[PDB]
Amino acid sequence: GSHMVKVLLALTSYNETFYSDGKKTGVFVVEALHPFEVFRKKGYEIQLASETGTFGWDDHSVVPDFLNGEDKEIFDNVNSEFNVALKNLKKASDLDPNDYDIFFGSAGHGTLFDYPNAKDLQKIATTVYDKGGVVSAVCHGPAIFENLNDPKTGEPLIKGKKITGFTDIGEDILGVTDIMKKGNLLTIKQVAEKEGATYIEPEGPWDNFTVTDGRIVTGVNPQSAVKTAEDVIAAFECN
């Protein structure tokens, strides 16, 4: 690949105390880092963006269990391409949506708050989709498809499409189900129901699992982020 292919790697802008233990949600590190690295190694240019130009990390995603090895080295090295890209992160409205050929929604629970109304990021997604690009997200990232009509059809972009994303049971295990129900924050299954999509549930909540429906590619969880990016490449190229 070349820098003529530009990936819009979307991050959530929501960064607030969220969990019962008082920790914050925000961007789940490896859901940005893994796809960044997959696309970088492929040769694409990657532009990070959030709806405000600001972000913070999900506190649960920076712990040794989830951030270790070469990932952590990249994260800690201020001169890594990943960190250069974070410094170059832009507010979505400051970008030209026509510049991008792939849209990839990184997540973390923060996305539940902003992605459904992130109209500038959403416009980049539909612009990408409507010119024959690939639109993708991992984990709660598919919240980007909530309230999102495809200009070419006048119907929800994922109407009649298959997607996956973070499981309902996963929300129980993380202790955020009640928080979500009180905030009218929709699980990805619920997003599919709202939009007339079909949610495909992985066998287990932590499985490395993706779904490709034409040029829509989704994955379940942090464990699926690499595969989601790889399967974006598969869907995007002929190769």
Written as one string, the DSSP assignment of 62-116 is: SSTTTS-HHHHHHHH-TTSHHHHHHHT-EEGGGS-GGG-SEEEE--STTHHHHGG
Q: What type of residue is 201?
A: E
**CB-based contact 112:143 (threshold 8 Å):** yes
Active-site residue among 31, 51, 171, 195? 171
Neighbours of 98 (CB within 10 A): 10
Contacts of 25 (CB under 8 A, 6+ apart): 14, 15, 16, 18, 19, 58, 59, 60, 108, 109, 110
Query: Quick count: other Cβ atoms within 10 Å of Cβ 45?
Result: 17
Catalytic residue among 140, 146, 195, 230: 140
Query: Catalytic residue at 31?
Result: no
Q: Please state whether beta strands 102-105 and 134-138 pair in parallel, antiparallel, or not at all (unpaired).
A: parallel
> At a CB cut-off of 8 Å and minimum separation 6, what does 13 contact?
50, 51, 52, 53, 54, 55, 110, 114, 118
Query: Do β-strands 45-50 and 90-91 pair in parallel, antiparallel, or remain unpaired?
Result: parallel
Residue spans of alpha helices (H) in the chain: 29-42, 69-76, 81-87, 111-114, 119-130, 168-173, 177-182, 188-195, 225-236
Active site residue 140: yes
Known catalytic residue at 139: yes
Per-residue tokens: 34: 């893994």
How far apart CA 94 and CA 188 sit, in angstroms, is 28
Pairing label, strands 155-156, 149-150 = antiparallel
Domains along the chain with CATH numbers: 1-239 (3.40.50.880)
Resolution, rounded to a tenth of an Å?
A: 1.6
